[PDB]
Design a protein around this ligand. Sequence first.
Ligand code: HDD
Ligand code: HDD
Lengths: 727, 727
Amino acid sequence: DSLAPEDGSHRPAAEPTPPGAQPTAPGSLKAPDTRNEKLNSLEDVRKGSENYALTTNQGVRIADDQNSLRAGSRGPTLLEDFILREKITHFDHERIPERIVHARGSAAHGYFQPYKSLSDITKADFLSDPNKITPVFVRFSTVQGGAGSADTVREIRGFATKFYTEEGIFDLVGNNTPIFFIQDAHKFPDFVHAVKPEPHWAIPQGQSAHDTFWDYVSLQPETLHNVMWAMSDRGIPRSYRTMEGFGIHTFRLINAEGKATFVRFHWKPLAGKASLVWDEAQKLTGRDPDFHRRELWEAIEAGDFPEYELGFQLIPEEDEFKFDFDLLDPTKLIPEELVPVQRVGKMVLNRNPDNFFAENEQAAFHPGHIVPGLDFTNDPLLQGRLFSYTDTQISRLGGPNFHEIPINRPTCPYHNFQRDGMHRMGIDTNPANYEPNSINDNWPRETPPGPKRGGFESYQERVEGNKVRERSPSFGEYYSHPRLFWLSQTPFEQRHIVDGFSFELSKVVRPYIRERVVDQLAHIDLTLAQAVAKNLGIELTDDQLNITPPPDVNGLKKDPSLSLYAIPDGDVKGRVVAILLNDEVRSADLLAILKALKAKGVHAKLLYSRMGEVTADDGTVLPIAATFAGAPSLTVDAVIVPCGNIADIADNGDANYYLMEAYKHLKPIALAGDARKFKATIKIADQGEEGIVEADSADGSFMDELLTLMAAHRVWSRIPKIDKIPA
Amino acid sequence: DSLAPEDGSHRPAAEPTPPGAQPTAPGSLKAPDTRNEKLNSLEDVRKGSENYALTTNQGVRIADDQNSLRAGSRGPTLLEDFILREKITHFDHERIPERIVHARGSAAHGYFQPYKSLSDITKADFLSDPNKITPVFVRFSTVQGGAGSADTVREIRGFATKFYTEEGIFDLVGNNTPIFFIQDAHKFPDFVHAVKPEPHWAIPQGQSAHDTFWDYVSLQPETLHNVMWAMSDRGIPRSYRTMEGFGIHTFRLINAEGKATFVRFHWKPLAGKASLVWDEAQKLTGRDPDFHRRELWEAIEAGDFPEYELGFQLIPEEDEFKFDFDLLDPTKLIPEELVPVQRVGKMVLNRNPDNFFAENEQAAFHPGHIVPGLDFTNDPLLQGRLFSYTDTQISRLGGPNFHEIPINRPTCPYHNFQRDGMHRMGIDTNPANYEPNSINDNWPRETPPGPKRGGFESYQERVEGNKVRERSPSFGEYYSHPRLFWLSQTPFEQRHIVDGFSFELSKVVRPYIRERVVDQLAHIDLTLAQAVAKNLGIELTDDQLNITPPPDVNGLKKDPSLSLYAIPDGDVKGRVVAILLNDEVRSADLLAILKALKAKGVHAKLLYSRMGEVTADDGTVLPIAATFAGAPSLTVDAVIVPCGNIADIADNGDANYYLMEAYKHLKPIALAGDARKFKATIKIADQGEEGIVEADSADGSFMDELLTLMAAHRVWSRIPKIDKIPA
Ligand code: HDD
Ligand code: HDD
């Protein structure tokens, strides 16, 4: 019975459409022509539905899926109802353990290709030829929260890429900041337990704003560098498309000659760097907890494919000890002013998955999954990570056959003597399950290392030392990198770092922990230490005021690539504007607005005080995407109010509040004709203000001004004006 | 090392303390003297820590828990480091599958006691004597969201009680509304899949405001009754302490003489019925996603023990068919005007757990766990539930020995012939593992049914009919219950219902689904259907305007017990007030305010624009709990502003917005002396308005008037005035 509408409006058109224009759908139905070797190889397990009978898992057609079998229509359910028991049994066992960390994440399929051959520095096959494409599957995530927690929390973000290469899977499992909080993997459980919800009551979710986190940080100054990055606006990215990615550790590249080059991996967002502001980010965790998940999915459905440039910081082996920090310490970054990022290739995410659980939830990434041409280093954090990502999926994915789950399967050949395990799919026909064997003439056989298609051989690094549980003395410096980061931020980014620390330490119940953290900031920078202390009602002592600042990092007093905004990198394609309608919209304003937005690939959402439709002055029927309250200004990049019958919305509380929230969060606002009467709500300027576009009508010049503001992301000059506004 | 502060301020006093006064802590350290039989029985597994050496799990003392074992202090980590591998292995497998539904939940320990013996109607031992105390463990929950989702979502809430009786565990697994969405358990996976995050992208979390939910609802009219309850303010409770609890299904009580009485279970909140308003609840999911978990835990630490009265609706076997609805249909409630709730006993929750994972996450409740004196009925939703809750713990809790996990163990004797299974703890010494046996003289033995301490025997209900997969025709009525609920609500409750439907349908992307739900609403009540249609820009057709309304339920046109607020049941103890400080508070106002609140058990939180302290006019040093942005008005029940230097915060945007937010959400606000200058922020007349307390000082009747407002919970008369207001 219950069937599709006559008009076919239940199903999304299979073509690129702007956010909200059609219901979202599984990738293979939304973009059936988008393919790559990995996506094609998943065809053996994709299951359709249209035109097929409803059955049990054993293939028996079901006649009545609305009722249990009972003795009489008001009688007891019978144990012989196997249809009911299979159905409820499968439901009863749907859930698998979520990831220990990074349980909340969003993923997509795409492809990668190098700009030129890197055969002089690496024999890795996926980087050997500019016209050789490698399928990828990428998962972005938060760290602390559960799989059902919110997206726009303040936290480091994960950025994991699975490269399905011809010589094996390579997983590049990184984060959105260039360093980690801790130095040795043995402390991982301590750090993670300290940031996770506290053990007695399991509070708080997705937040480092609580006593145990700041207690750990206060006792472990090695954490201060990554804590600086988390308290800055880097901890609240606007989108997964607008953040950087880093492998953090120094790895090695190995060429066909056997030469090792130290390398740090980078991803540069071709959409530019952009972050929310705290009040915005926190409120958005409640208005739309799935904001980043949704935004990535919709950008891909709209054709705004997330694009990232892979880059390498390369250090010759003979320069291992030439910096004033250890290259193997993951709490230290390598300034781009000392070692530039060489561009390597481009990654494009162009298709969403079909089933989130099957492809995203069960995907398994692991930094140990390297290929010939790559190798590790002794970084003590990376060294212990190698143990954990294989170990954890024995419970998470139920066994050692996790490489047979469709999303994890290599697309290149895989043959060996491993057998059995839970849910074994592969049926081995080799007469032998051991080597050396004569009964199958020793196949499959080992392969000597070589320039291409060779077996994996570890670089023969020289090891000299006693068996010790000891931190290297070279890792014992905790304040110079934090300071380099601080001085490289713009004045408004510095204020937001101060505000992040102040907000988080205000939620620490035990005051001495706050004091201890303030003492640590005084070892980094006294201006920062004093601004935080002032917000906590703390007075620095005379000793604290005399702590000597840490040395500069190799002579650097700042490095602009550490800042999100110092060097302009705005890109408006894929951004979104809210357009506040009225019941008699001036169609000439809307025409000019939409045309200019379209030309720069910026989307719009038409909002009103009710759903349904409104009719413009020329009879155009305008469908409403959402109400003012239903899609708050938190969800858009700018707000435009066209003329028409402004009296209709002039006294609307939500419409006025929409503009006050956008104003507070530093977003560009554009007001045309009678819409300029809303300037009184945002109680400011009469001759106009930088950041507020106004004109008798919406024209080419009005739209050019708005789009120029949007390319600079936010109106930072308005900061001084927002803390009086009651919003 | 000896890291704690010498003043001993790292540790919370072991005595009842108001919310925010000390750091929260494990139940047994916070209230060591609070005991019960179950709490005492868990002492065999409680583990301390103070003064013990740090070890491996095998008991080997660890010397250096800061580093991995490596060859050289900058060398590679060695595989022989078993201390590192055990510690990371345990971390790597910490997580277990979350509950399929009700994954988000907060729990506590308590006790129950009947008011009088109920031996005339049931032989259940826990109900046989007013001096028999039964330990309980209660878990409150949401339904759709994961364990890391937010508390204050719009949804039904779970209310599960484990009764540790002398004759077995009895689990009463109910919800906060008296009916469920569906009639037969076979449809549980369809209904749950429709409400859970959609399968392609796993959005949205914690929300029924999406297409698949409303699609299923539109095609299955049996769901309308519980959907009405969810769309009302019942869907957003202020606290687990202020909501009702229901078993939903008709069960049986069996007495010693073998007589069966039909029974429906109720829990009445002794703190009264109270809910939030949608904008507040939604925003509170961002500002504090753990608000309910937090409020429960803090209530117990403050001595505001959650108290509930167990009540029974009792219906004689001969009256089975005397109502307009089927007693076994879980989508129908039994109006209290037809069958009163008989008061049975009281439950008091008075201790938090020690470890959330061990006691809360691993607890297993199942409605099939009944005891002699209780029995089931043929309700087709309850019949299928009996299969699911034993089945699901085979994956959730790892095996069939889940009754051996400490929190789940019976406190009464358990002996049988069951053996082995994963994680087996009990070591059986019986020579036999089968019966009948002669080798252990048939022990343990079967026990005949009897008045007390007898074996379980099912009531011999007559069963007659053919084996059919058929819904009883008596369940085919879907609109009279929804209509009875609607007519029982106050006018402001009806508006909140209209708003709930309107908001949720506005997030449904496919317009025809909105239209189809509106058509179902037209079968319930025309006023409701017109108001929702108007908010969606939908016009009812002439056919919809003439749909005849469903009949009354057994002659009733309303039942005030269905309303949260029609009949005042206000209780201020355990509520909390925000007090907005300034840098020279009139100490006389604060003395009056705080002492009046304390005499009624109402908590306070002193807020300011920074942390630390402020000094009152007389030199009193005032400790600040949180900033205005740090502890938003969403978290309190009322706001009071004392006189003093009001110029200090008069122009603070946050302080003004604090009042605008509380005013919008209908909370009582009290302004003393010069604090009346904030009247212009919320546009209050010179003469004043009901809901705003104002005077020259906080003396005389100022606090009594504020407390009277708190007793009515919210200022419903202000709704028309908030309509506008930009907040
Ligand atoms: C020693 C243990 C340990 C340490 C020191 C780290 N982590 Fe890790 N991480 C794990 C133990 C692990 C894990 C327990 O193995 C996880 C969750 C389960 C999973 O499959 O892998 C994981 C997941 C995980 C993910 C999610 C992959 C996904 O999307 O499935 C990413 C992005 C990171 N980690 C990144 C980092 C980076 C950049 C680190 C430091 C530089 C780091 N991890 C240190
Ligand atoms: C046939 C399946 C089925 C049906 C029809 C119901 N549920 Fe259920 N529910 C389960 C399948 C289940 C479950 C899969 O077995 C769960 C989840 C995990 C668990 O242990 O139990 C569960 C958990 C569960 C919880 C959580 C207990 C805790 O806190 O752990 C409560 C409060 C409810 N349910 C209440 C209800 C009520 C009042 C129902 C209708 C009257 C309902 N359920 C119908």
